[PDB]
Each structure stands twice: as C-alpha cells, then as structure tokens.
Amino acid sequence: GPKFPRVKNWELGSITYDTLCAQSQQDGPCTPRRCLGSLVLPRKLQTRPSPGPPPAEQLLSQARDFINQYYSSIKRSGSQAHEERLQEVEAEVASTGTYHLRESELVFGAKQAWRNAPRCVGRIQWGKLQVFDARDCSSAQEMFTYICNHIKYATNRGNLRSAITVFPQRAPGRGDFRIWNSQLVRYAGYRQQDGSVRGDPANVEITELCIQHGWTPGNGRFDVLPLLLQAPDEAPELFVLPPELVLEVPLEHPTLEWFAALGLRWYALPAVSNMLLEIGGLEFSAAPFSGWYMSTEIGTRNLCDPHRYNILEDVAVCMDLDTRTTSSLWKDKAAVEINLAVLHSFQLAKVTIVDHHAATVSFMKHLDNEQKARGGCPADWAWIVPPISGSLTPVFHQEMVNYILSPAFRYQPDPW
C-alpha cells in the first residue's frame, strides 16, 4: 500500500499512514540496526555551543525552508511577497551572516515548535499560545522584568494561560542570553552531611550554583530557588522571585485527613527555561515557555520517583500498607492516592490542572486533527503514555511515529 509508515490503533482497530514524517530534515538516533527511542538525551538535536558563525549555506537553506513554511501557512506560497521575503533573507544573510524574523514569523515559528514537540501531550492547545516578544531585552535586569511579567500573565491567579517569552537570538561571536535554571520555578536541593538530600534532588547542582553566586540558602524541603540570569558576555546575575508572584498549592487528600499533615506542596506554573527554540536556523537560547500541569507530572514523577522526593514509602506507611512485600501493591495504592491528592488540591485552590485521563483523551483528538491537517503527528510513545495507569488511557493503544520537525525546541548544553 502507501509507502509511508502504517500506524494502527489497537483499541479501535483503525489504521492511518504518516506522510508528514516525509518532511523531516533532521535525523533522529535510530537506524535499521537498532532502536534508540528510549534514550532521554540522544546526541542528535544537541545544540552544542557553535561559536564560529553557522555555514551561510546551511543557514540559508534552513531559512528558506522556514520562510516557505510561513508563506504556505498564510496561503501566499509563490506570491510576490513570498519571493521578496526570500530575497530579503538571502540579502541580509549575505552581508551580515545572519538574519531576523518579522514579528508574525516569530509567532508562527514559536507555535509550530510547540506543535512539533513529540513529547508534549498538551499539544491540542498549540494554537492558543501567547507569544511575548522580548527581542529588545539588553540586560539581565530586564530579563528578570520580562520573566516576572511572563509569570504574572501565565499564572493569572490560578486560571493559567500558555505563554512563551522570546529573548534575543544567538549572534556570531557574541555571548548568548541564558537562563541557568531549568525551570522558572524550582525547589532547592540541599546536600546533607550524610550524603542524602533535603528538598528536590534534581536541583542540587543549580542550588549550589546559586549559593556560589551569592544566594543565602534556606534549609527547607520546598524553598523556591532564585534565578541566575545571564546577558551576553556577562557573569550571571541573581534574582529572587517576589513570593507573591509564585503561586503554590498545599496538598491535601479528599478523604485521608492526615495527608495534609505531611506538609507537601507544589507550584502551579510549569515553566521550562533551559531549552533552545530553533526557527529557520536562528537559535533562541533563552525562550522560557509555560502551560499548566498534567497531574502525574507532580503526583507520580516529581513526588514518587526514586531520585526525586521519593515519598511512596512514607505515604504507604501512613496508609498502613505492607511495604515488606511487592505483591501487596503498596506502591500502586500509595501512588494513586498521591495523584488524587494533587488533583483534589489544585481543584480546591482553583488552579488549572488536567488529570492523565482527560489529557490523553484530548491528545487523541489532537492526533485526529493533525492527521487531517498535516497527515500525521510526531509523537514519542514513551513520553506520551502516563507514568501510572498507562494502558487505562487511550494513547497506550495508539502506535506512534517519532521524528524531528522544525521549528523545534531542543536541549542545549548547560552554560557553566
């Protein structure tokens, strides 16, 4: 039949073919010999710091492709305006080695990068992203102002709104604008005398960096970290987020009255800040984006991963379960109640959140929309299927094709 991947949904028995993958111009880590789809960080999209200017030929081809994508999106492909823009880009790159995007092109590209993210289950919302243009930012202090504005707009007192703030693109020879923190809101991780960690173990390095740079540390389990913001060719500067701007949700359980006593909590805004936004060859090294949480992110991964808060055993003990044997399914029982507590608490505090069932159902709709609109949707099965109750959600039974499309969000080396 069709010379494209045949994709089947085993729950419904339906079949689709992915023709969109044909547009991928960037190779992933797999080969006919072996599949490396499970690797979290495969040395592929890795946007290593490339000081020397990018090959004008490579950049130009990437730029032309993007401009073509833009004009096709506004249904003016092949038009005079299209050819004139292509000429403007080539001319600008010719005399300067690089080029700049028009406002509308940046908005289109940022939304397309989200739309193209294979690991994001919230993509049905891709068209509603609010793009803040911060390409005029010229200092770390101003970065903080833009970030604070992003946080206030995005949080919106609990009725969260997707948003991305785009700071100046990388420029040949010149230093990058960088946000050192992995997220705008993160809890400190303090190494202890015995070797253990108080707080979030995932943030030990950034916490120590904040200290090395003048931050007076606290000693709690949920201390919000300050931000290390860096402007071109300058040492990073430290900024403490005004507490009133960081909305948090104390965790309680709907029926287990003792759960509130655990003193657990989490912040409302998930804002990834260390990824690179690539559009038509241009690289935006500082472009924090945010949406709202899918509950298993907090309840299962952040709170129960062995290398994170690891609270499974503490909650199981409180539930008086047999943590002495696997067959009691104590981990499963505790995890369920922890996830329920998260949903219950966010709902009580009127803070946007989506459970894994609702999220995956909406992602199935997204897949259907994209099948019609683009002939497919790049998706990373391992990241799309929730960490708990996998096969109880519709995406588990949906085969998926994973590939890289641009514009895109990519991992980049740490600035230190």
Place this chain on the structure above:
Amino acid sequence: KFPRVKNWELGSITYDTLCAQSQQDGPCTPRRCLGSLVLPRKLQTRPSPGPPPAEQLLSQARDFINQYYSSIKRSGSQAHEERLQEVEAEVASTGTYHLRESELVFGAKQAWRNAPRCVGRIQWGKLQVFDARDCSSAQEMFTYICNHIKYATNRGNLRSAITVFPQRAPGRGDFRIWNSQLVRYAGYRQQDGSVRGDPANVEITELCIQHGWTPGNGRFDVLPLLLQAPDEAPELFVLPPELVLEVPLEHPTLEWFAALGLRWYALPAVSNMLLEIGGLEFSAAPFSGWYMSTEIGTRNLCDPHRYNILEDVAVCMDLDTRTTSSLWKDKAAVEINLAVLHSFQLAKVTIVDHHAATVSFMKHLDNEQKARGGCPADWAWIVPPISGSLTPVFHQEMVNYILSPAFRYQPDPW
C-alpha cells in the same frame, strides 16, 4: 557507534556493544522511529515454496553452529569443524539442513534470551525443550501439545517449556497451530455487535465453529485447538478439561468481587510465533512460562477491546465514575490486579507481580551486560501497563535490536 545507555534512577552508564552483532533490520531509520509499532510492516516471514539462497542460509547456519560450539567451550575443535562440513554438505546438496537435538535445545533457549519484549528472561536458562520433529499428523501434534500442557502446568507449580514441531520445508505446507495460544477463551459475536467472552478471539472462535465445533455461550469457554499438518485442512481437537488449570478470581477484602464470576487460565502458551534457528524456521513451536499479574489484571481484564471490566468493578466499589479526575479507573485497576495475585496465590498457582518481575529483569540486564556486553530490550513492552514509573525498568534506557536465534511473527495460516 555503540550507544551510551543510562539509568536515570541510579545515574549509572553502560555501553551496548552486543547490538553490533545484529544482522537483521528493524523498522526504524534516522528519519523516523517506529518502535511503538506492534507488528512488522515488511519484517514479516514470507512463504517458503522455494529454497532460500544457499549462501544466505549457509551464512546463517555457520554463524549459529559457531554460537553453539562457543557455548560448550569447544570452538575450533575437531567436532566443530566436522559439524560445519556436515551443514555445508547438506545445504549444497539439498538446499536445507537439519539440527541435532543438542543444537535445537541451545537454539530455543537463545531465542528466548534474545526476545526484546520478554521481561521474564532471567529464567532463560531453565527451559524444558521438547523435540517434536518426529511428528507427521495433526493428531500427533495434539498428543505432544497435551503432554506439553501437563508438564508445564505441573499442578500449579508451572515450569517453562517449548515443543518444537517439524521445520518449514521448500514448496511444502507448514505445520501450524491456528490458535494464538494453547488456552484461550471464546469470543461470540452477538445481535447488537457486542461480544460475549474474549473479543480478541472472535475470528478464531468462528473458524472453530466453521470446522465442526459446537459452541458454548459463556464468557469463559475454553476454545478447542485447530492443528494443521502440511497441506491439509486444519483438524479440531478438544482439550481435556482436567488438563486446563483455571483460577477463580476473588478479592482479599472485597467479598463481592468473587460474585463477578471472573476467572483466568494458569498457563500462558503462545503458539502462533515462528522460531528461527540458524536460518531454519519452525512454524509451530508453542512455548509457555507463567503469568505476570498485569497481563491478566490489567490488559486481559481491563483493556477497552478485551473484557473491559473497569466500570463494572468501579460501580461495585461505588466509585465516582462521573468524572475522570476521581481516578476511579486507577483505583479499580489496582484492586483487580490485587485480586489476580491473591487468587493465584490462594490456588497455589505460579504468578509474579510486576514489581518483582521488573526487579528480576534489572538483574538480568546486569547479568547480560557482563556476559554479552548488552541486552536487546523493548522499553514499551518491558515497562508494565500500570504503575510504570513505580518500577525500576521505567528509569532504565534500553536498546532494541534483533538477534538470532529469534521468535518472530508470521502470517495467519488462513
């Protein structure tokens, strides 16, 4: 070249060098990954009316023969050289060759060891291999199958086993077991399209009826076997009820669970896969071990396209099925899995929970890293269908590739 494999829970790293020994291609390419696809688009197993290229078969055969003598620490030995000549001579004169029982045993165990989707491979060394190549009729296939089931069931103390029927031969029909497993429950289509029993077995159920089987009308009617000898219509055989051990499902604390009338068989015996050893193909080689509880409690009983009992259990539990956010599905699934474990344990029937299983697989990965420099594994199949990240394998990166000997999918014989 060799992939860096990281375990995110422990921060440890390893390098898979075993993948370089892969001579068979998967469905992925640098342009796109198709790792979540269940069945092969082209990597199927085309007909055997004509003999495979002598050089291709010979190369696969020599490699296998090499693997064998290396396993018994006798490479380069006189026996090794003589065996290679025997194989060469047979292929050159007949276009095919035959394995000696010791080689077949080694090959069957290696195929299991190489299965990327199997989480129970720590047991790979203990596999009872039954040589059924001395079989010339459907009736004889039935006798071997019944003996397989008796041995493997062992009154609830399950033992891993495989029975190997005659290999495929050029231009001749295949020996085949039409059923997907030796023990399966019927699936009867009814008036309004619904299905009574296991929806996954509708087609096979109908084929049996079409071949003379008098259908029952329950939700758990054990199906008869359709066994086929070369170029002959398949024959119907009813398995003796006393050979099929089943476990009634009840819950440790929820008295009403037992009232659901749920049950499941003790022996999981896949019978429609092809066993490939040294270029040779065994179209009928049913194998079995024991169940990991999520297979029954989560997939078989809760999949939307299977028994789909989630809502029934949720109602008996009086959960708030009004919204997804009450996590009623999650709560019910957990109790159903607990009921499965409780019931098998009560009935003294072998079974392993997903935590114990994944823990053993992590040990297997370490054992294999030391022994062969890696282990082919399919993450989507290794990580359990519920509580994924609550198990160690979720946090372990894996490399998937095809090694031979191997178990592979093949077209349905109808």
